[model samples]
Target: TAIFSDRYKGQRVLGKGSFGEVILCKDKITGQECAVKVISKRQVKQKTDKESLLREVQLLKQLDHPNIMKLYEFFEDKGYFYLVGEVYTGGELFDEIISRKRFSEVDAARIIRQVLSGITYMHKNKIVHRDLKPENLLLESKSKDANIRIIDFGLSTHFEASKKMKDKIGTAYYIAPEVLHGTYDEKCDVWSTGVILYILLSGCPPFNGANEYDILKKVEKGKYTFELPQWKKVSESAKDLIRKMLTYVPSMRISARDALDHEWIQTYTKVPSLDNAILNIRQFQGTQKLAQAALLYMGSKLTSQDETKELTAIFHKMDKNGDGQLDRAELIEGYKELMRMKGQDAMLDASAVEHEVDQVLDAVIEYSEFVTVAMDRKTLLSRERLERAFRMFDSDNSGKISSTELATIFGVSDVDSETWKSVLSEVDDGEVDFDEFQQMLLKLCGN
Candidate 1:
């Protein structure tokens, strides 16, 4: 007896595609904005198409990562299946990259770091994001520094430890060579990431072609050179990392965890600016921007719309006085809370953190501005804090904690068991794993 029509009010069409269309909607009860994906049952004529759609929903339901798009809920109508989820107003990743005045090595490294972190989470959960491309990477907001969210999991699949998948699926320029042979594993994603990194650093795909066939041939040959003059300015450490990731042999490619610990990624800030590389990007900026815009238009056709409610919740928490905006004092208080949650001694002086806020606000932080700073802090927070927080609740070391344990840790002892169950069930099931627990802590800590 779940009724979608009774709960959501559709506002306008956000996007349209062959199978379905996405629309902006508002939750009747909470009055929060969200996106609803409306898929026609008749259009899903092929078994494979239906299966893929169902699989995507199932996988999204299990995933709970900041970098991964979120699914709030789904319901079926008489003629359509509707999925309500997060809304990303920001454009595609490549669009942002091309629009920037200068795309430096440090900027490229930061983007890749977030992408790898998301991939690491998926691989840990036995999932493979088969399609990893700039088009599928979305920003949470319009800012250049916005957090990236990996979207479009239609081709993704879950695999067991001992099994290797055989699927020749992915974008031509970014697909792994092993995938063309019709045999691959999670390492395929690493190869795709290498392609993205190459493009990010140099503003062009390593394997160029007039068509898909030409691109595949270059990828299969697994031979590419950094002989361009732009490459002369890129650091040796970065090129080394790219070579390791683009290794022809699947098993020989660097794992996501190892890539995170790579010298180039770890020391990106210290990597000197690639001035020649920037000049190369500028040379192709005009045409690249146009192509990138069209691709971004296609990608924007379907966006998840579940983050608004969470944003509203976090905004009110920091507003303190119900003043609709966070003043300098309230912003500083939020920073203090963030520091305390991480068990740190507030190394950033309160005034300095406040000064870091954009002066465009004129001393007042709006919702969008607040989210940008908070998300940046979230990404920069140490993994040590996340691990420690997870361990504090996971007393059994069994890698799973139950709702009762969560209630105790959340200090909901005063509430009844039914109420506590209702609250915990919103974000997770009765039992929570390490990733789920980590996400919960991050949200509570205003990350």
Candidate 2:
């Protein structure tokens, strides 16, 4: 299995980093293809030297997961460490998201769930992935959903879950507040997960800056706002999960186990059999398309078209208390049915289910808006005022303001960009007419 001569001369370059170039090579004896990370001794000597290589070797050896990258074998010759591993043909997840504008909740959630499961396993084994970001995430070849495999464990180490460690690592955008302050533990990973969740859900990070200091400051303060119009249409469950994960209070932050127990994860975990009616209504075309496309792109079918039909049927069936719609409760019931059919009983809360329902509704609204118009000027103009108004109209303190509340205040739906320009152009005399405000309200409601 050793490449002693120019035998691997035919190897093609897969990627390159500061450490070395990764080449795609084939085993002469077994005829198995592998990605060989050819790291020069000089490069290792200049960086952490043997420490970095040893860390990577140790971490990769200890790790094991279908969603995680696998390291097969390793060898060294004249100061070069030829780290041979699985040759994953799939590219970066960020590329797919960038090309698609935004990912549907189901696809995004599927990817994230895998990532969490992988990280949870890593933590369970007492390994801390000091660097967990999009760049380190790789996709498996010949699989559907582009099943993720976490790589680049140079910054990883074994640590006790309850104890704090002082080491500043990870991409600046994803660095946790505890890490910034110098005391951190497994919860730091939770914070990083939050940042990843933010990026996946909103197509952007929680903070951005021209310089590192500014970005760090933003992360430290934990003060950020969502593009309401865009985010409003995202699932409430997804948002709630992110909020709980991103909570500044580390003590109050949801644990990995708790996160698994969370309504968002549970609702998704269920099979779409019991009350498929409710699930069906929540089935936005965009969501289905993303799931189906991701599977195709990954080169494996995540769910067959026939299976989708069955799930869809179940989803439609449970949307019983149809308010011309469905919420998380009905979805959970569907999952419960799925579990029941599978002969298992796992009780889940309805409120969390509602959150999932919220996301389904949000995605549908956004899908509708995206197809109908490129931009809603009225909504954009009303951004600041609408944020404030959301509090006013959310009389129930439910953290949600309905479309009717908006339509009742703003008399028309056909209000155009020009009309919005006139409304925003004039200074508020501390007030404005509701009918003239349709555009702004629509934006707040995510159009």
Candidate 3:
């Protein structure tokens, strides 16, 4: 096994996190850049607390979403555990908001939409991020339209229906009344988002404080008002959505899925209409299982943010239910409407849409899968990116990926044995060479 110091060379201190220091680093093997968090081990001294630490690592390993931060690898030494991740340069969302001197209603909505989507994904997986706040949201770049990533998971739990948790975590202003009452569930995260939205819109936390108790007291009572002059400019629908998210009763609070569907978030969208985009989607037959491993790696590990921006928007817009998967109805409706709006005959009925899309799209399509089919193949499968991806999987510098190496490539559990067996079948020989990988990409990529 490779050591963290041997692989990642620290460039600088990226940020001082609550419990760790994030170091900007370069991967020696592939020559790509990433972030590494080195935090001192604690709480882990207790045996049971140590199990919680392991559980967090396992959950982080399973994470895969554009809006959420990814943990590429982690290792520990006597003093610290080195956690590797994606590089986000825009810093925290709140800092970005402050840098602007003020913010637009649209910025608040856009940031909240992505945050809600990320939360929806976590909740879908039955995990609760109990530490959601402005501090936890990160921007991928310094650009005006950079994507937001949910970067921290310090106080998270994979929850079940009957069990409620306490052990109070998260900032006071962002904590839900239910959490303060010593029992709460996934809806705590929803309330936290509501508090952030309120702050973004009004430029102040809804629950104010002379001290922490002043804030928690207000949070417990769910007391906040938008009587300020700044709020007068905000849309009523936006206010309505926030109210729904911040409802005093956890049951009455809107779920992230429903908040995404709320009028304020839905009122503005910019899904670009590419000619024959639907045609391209309909004709897409996703790659075979062997290539599925390759494309999955490329889609998540090798994709460029600027390149995937449009497709990301398109995928989210078409994902009507916001359950992180686009289904048949969404596909049909999206295709029909995009065609009709673009004056392209609008004549692909449901069955016709199903015929081509169904070949690749099963019951649903994930963001990564949709992207593999819909993205510009030439840009996505460029020689340079392919080389980097290949090198990472070809860990021994063998210049070829062998059958056993596929396990290393998969990275984590959560892929069912059924799916694993399918991916396992992709090995044509004991190993696959460079030309074979490229050839596979071009063939499935419709090059």
Candidate 4:
């Protein structure tokens, strides 16, 4: 048990979970950086955290790929297990998408592919990322597209062709039908990948209701589609992949390797050479993550009155300029600052980022419209008028609006700083007082 101050002293905590904390540290001698995941002995003992850690190490040691996070080494000291590994600068893919609100098929496909690649490697080595979700997929810092490192293999289990994994484990929403039914294997990761894709494309999980059972029922029935209008623009290739990966019958589920080989990803190969395709995919995946993070933050603020004060505080911090609204520049700048604060370099800004943001915002506005219509708000917007407004708001000439535009539609603008602050405060004052904004906008529409 040695205390290597040089190897750990420059560390800054990156994340914390139920069993441990992750720190970004500089290796003093090597002058290299690594993410040191420290699992506490107490929690390791209580929750079998040691098992998960060992599983992660074992899986990581056996599998290596550009799309998967790399493991440098591990050490033990006193009662703590220190996992030293490659430091990914990009943030969590899920957090990225949540930031942006949602993702399109292209973007979603990129993320799914990364998941598939990592899972493909794991499956090849007979390992399952039993808890596959957005949370476990980490990216190399701020870059729009970068290498993805799959972390947290706590629930991971090794399986062979004849073996069946019966223990029910994984995030509820991403659990496969077989897992819910008490029969599962590596393909369960594919199902979870499907769930992530569905969420990305629709900004809603395929199966959702009041309880876990309800969601399970929906997933089991396989009753879901990209039929939502916002998803109409998603590529057929992406949809096809989802169909295969999420099939109710595990027998019919697509393998991670096969998914990587699918026609959907192949189409991208036509645009960029294989290497560039990987680059493009990595970039898109990063954007998808950021968008998700932004949207989740916004959605929570919009939905919970009790969380308003805290949410506003966070949003203001992200806003950076103290402007009442978050414009594209503000968002990008704020994101840059966040990356820097996190001790990572600035990376990832695509021409399409703005458009994607608009699409997210449009969906939010449409959902709002649906709610108002349901409430018998007379003549707020005819279907045609609503569609027209959405079209205008999108302004991308791309038909879909991104989350940035959605924020603007909800009174926040991603274009002009001055406009965002003025319009947003005037309409909702960061609270998005739905009733007030709805009534005022309806009146202004001359309805």
Strongest candidate by TM-score:
1
The TM-score of candidate 4 is 0.53
Q: Which segments of candidate 3 are over 4 A away from where they belong?
A: 43-52, 154-170, 270-447
Give the alpha-carbon lDDT of every model.
0.64, 0.53, 0.62, 0.54
Give the candidate number with the greatest lDDT: 1
Q: Note each model's CA RMSD in angstroms.
A: 23.6, 23.0, 25.3, 16.2
How many clashes show up in model 3? Answer: 0
State the weakest 10-residue window (summed lDDT) of model 4: 160-169
* Candidate 2: segments with Cα more than 4 A from true spot: 1-10, 44-59, 100-102, 142-144, 154-170, 249-251, 269-447
- The residue ranges of model 4 lying beyond 4 angstroms of the native Cα positions read 1-7, 45-59, 95-104, 158-170, 210-217, 220-222, 271-447
Candidate 2 displacement at residue 402 in angstroms: 39
Instruction: Give the C-alpha lDDT of model 2.
Output: 0.53
Our model 1 lands, by Cα RMSD against the true structure, at 23.6
Per-residue lDDT tens digits of candidate 4, residues 217-276? 787787786766645556677788889988888878888888888988766533211232
Model 2 clashing-pair count: 28
Q: How are the candidates ranked when ordered by TM-score, highest leading?
A: 1, 3, 4, 2
Cα deviation at 186, candidate 3, in Å, is 1.4
List, residue by residue over 1-447, the lDDT tens digit for candidate 2.
354333342255575533455777766566778777666554344334556656667667766788667777766665566666787777766644443422466666677787788778777766666567776678775444578887754333422111100011125678778877877777777778778777665555687653346667898998877663447656678788998888887888887667777777777645111122112222212222222222122211111222344444566676565433445455546544543443221112233334544544455422222211212221233343444444433445666434333322221122233544455444223233433343343332233
Candidate 1 accuracy as TM-score: 0.57
In model 3, residue pairs whose N, Cα or C atoms come closer than 3 Å (at least 3 residues apart or on different chains), thus clashing, are: none
